[PDB]
């Protein structure tokens, strides 16, 4: 039907601005620290600590199979990517710091996003 190929449209406007909001995203963390999953090889107990990993090669996978239907949905994924290192690293750690920072400087971003979002429909 028509109608199934303009939601079909809709869905890859979305799943473009995501892409281009995780780029920005991505950006404010030039050290890496969130770019790939955390290493059950080098963190052999991760999964008793946290039980929903996230990381941006995982989101990345997703936007690319059109998995995000809203922002909202993608927002709490970044929001995993912050909320599970501070809660694993403590507070004195790079790993927390770089949260902090990815965290506070990607809320900017989202700001905008949610406008341009709403916006474009």
Known sequence: SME????????????RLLRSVL?????????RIFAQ???LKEVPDYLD????????????????????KNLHEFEEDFDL???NCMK????????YRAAVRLRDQGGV???????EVDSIG
């Open 81 to 83: 990517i912050i909320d």
């Open 37 to 39: 999953p955390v290493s």
């Open 23 to 31: 780029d920005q995203l991505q950006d404010k963390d030039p050290a």
């Open 109 to 115: 971003v989202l700001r905008q996003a949610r406008r």
């Open 4 to 15: 199934q190929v303009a939601m079909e449209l809709r869905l890859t406007e979305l799943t």
């Open 88 to 95: 694993y690293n403590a507070r004195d750690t790079v790993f």
């Open 49 to 68: 600590h946290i039980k929903h990993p996230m990381d941006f090669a995982t989101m990345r996978k997703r936007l690319e199979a059109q998995g995000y």
